[PDB]
Amino acid sequence: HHSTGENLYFQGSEVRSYLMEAHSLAGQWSLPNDRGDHTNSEAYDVNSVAIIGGGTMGKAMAICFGLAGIETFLVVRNEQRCKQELEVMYAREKSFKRLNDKRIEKINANLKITSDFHKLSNCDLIVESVIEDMKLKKELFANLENICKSTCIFGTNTSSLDLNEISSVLRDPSNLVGIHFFNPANVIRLVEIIYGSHTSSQAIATAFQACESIKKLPVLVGNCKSFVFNRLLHVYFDQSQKLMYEYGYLPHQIDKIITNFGFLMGPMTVADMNGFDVMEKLKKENGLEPNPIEKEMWRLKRYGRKTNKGFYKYDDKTQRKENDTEMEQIIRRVAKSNIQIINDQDVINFMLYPTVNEGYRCIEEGVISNESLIDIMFILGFGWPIHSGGPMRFGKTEGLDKIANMLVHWSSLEPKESAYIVADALKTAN
Numbered sequence: 001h002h003s004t005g006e007n008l009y010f011q012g013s014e015v016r017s018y019l020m021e022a023h024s025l026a027g028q029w030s031l032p033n034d035r036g037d038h039t040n041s042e043a044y045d046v047n048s049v050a051i052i053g054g055g056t057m058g059k060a061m062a063i064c065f066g067l068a069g070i071e072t073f074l075v076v077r078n079e080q081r082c083k084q085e086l087e088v089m090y091a092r093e094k095s096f097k098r099l100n101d102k103r104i105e106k107i108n109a110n111l112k113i114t115s116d117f118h119k120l121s122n123c124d125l126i127v128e129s130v131i132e133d134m135k136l137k138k139e140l141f142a143n144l145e146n147i148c149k150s151t152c153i154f155g156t157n158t159s160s161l162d163l164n165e166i167s168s169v170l171r172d173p174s175n176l177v178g179i180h181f182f183n184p185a186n187v188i189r190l191v192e193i194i195y196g197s198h199t200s201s202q203a204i205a206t207a208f209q210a211c212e213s214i215k216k217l218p219v220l221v222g223n224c225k226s227f228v229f230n231r232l233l234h235v236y237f238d239q240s241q242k243l244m245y246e247y248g249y250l251p252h253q254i255d256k257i258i259t260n261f262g263f264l265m266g267p268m269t270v271a272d273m274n275g276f277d278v279m280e281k282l283k284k285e286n287g288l289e290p291n292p293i294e295k296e297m298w299r300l301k302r303y304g305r306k307t308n309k310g311f312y313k314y315d316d317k318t319q320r321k322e323n324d325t326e327m328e329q330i331i332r333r334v335a336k337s338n339i340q341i342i343n344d345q346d347v348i349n350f351m352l353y354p355t356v357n358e359g360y361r362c363i364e365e366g367v368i369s370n371e372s373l374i375d376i377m378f379i380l381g382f383g384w385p386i387h388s389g390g391p392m393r394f395g396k397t398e399g400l401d402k403i404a405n406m407l408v409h410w411s412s413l414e415p416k417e418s419a420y421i422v423a424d425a426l427k428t429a430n
């Protein structure tokens, strides 16, 4: 989960994230019922960390801890392949300006690659990022218990396995917690701290403080919220596509409006980054139906950066983004729409209002709590129309009333599109 840039769509720019993060209450965490909270929970200091597994997430997490000046062991099967893979990663990240030689120097002075466990006995936090094999994970933690100090918090980045199974094998199952970083990890600050049924307040506090010390922004949740992000993403992005085929907007125009609003990157830019084949492979699983722009683009196998052409074009040298004339022909070639879009503000509303509504849809369906969703979106830098203090500036609006009205009005002109059907939880919060 989260390993293919799904949350880049929602990542705020440095400034917008600066301004939006202040409104998250996620630091004020509580476990369910009477299990403990941030007022009554002791955090052990994290002076030393271990990340088990040298895959993409393993490497990305180890980089994050190393960058902060924390002694980090990266425990892998093949130390030599690992150092090689890490070099490719360093080079790719610099090319995106996510890292530079000075920060790589700091990582390297703190990062120790190894395949030996008896190096870990003084580690305060160990996060497993191995293959999704229940028996392997069980034995690995069962293994670490009788070699690590009793204060050691065990993290697992598992997506497909049940956190309680894995704990079901420690003598002390209270120190196992789920920890999800988000790709790309030098860009997205959000981290999910996922509690099991037995996860202790200490484990929670220790993980929280650890993430904070590495300049990440943790949130406490009862399960992984990938489903939520996917749902938000698909609504956001479908709207974004309508701007191209129903209206005459070109990728750089949409993306410019989005980045002007304060997002780090526009949707077409992000889709190219992530590989637009991902979207095709999705409908290849439950076909279909592909919209005019997708239909034609997938034919031409324009998948983004990996195919050097996508919504943009990427020249061969330093792989630099440039506008593409063939893409515009596809756009021009496809009157239309009763819904009015005349200016930049309407463009933003067309994209963001239906995304906000889908969040409320997730809330009322029990997929996510109201508080979790809102803290997450502030942390991402996306923002929210409403916060704990009441109405919140969200573009050229505040609160939910104009949003609710615009959605019902859009539902009038297009009553078949679910994206405009207002949720009861939205009406409620309004």
Ligand SMILES: [Zn+2]
Pocket (backbone or CB within 6 Å): 001, 002, 180, 192, 223, 224, 225, 226
């Ligand atoms: Zn997750």
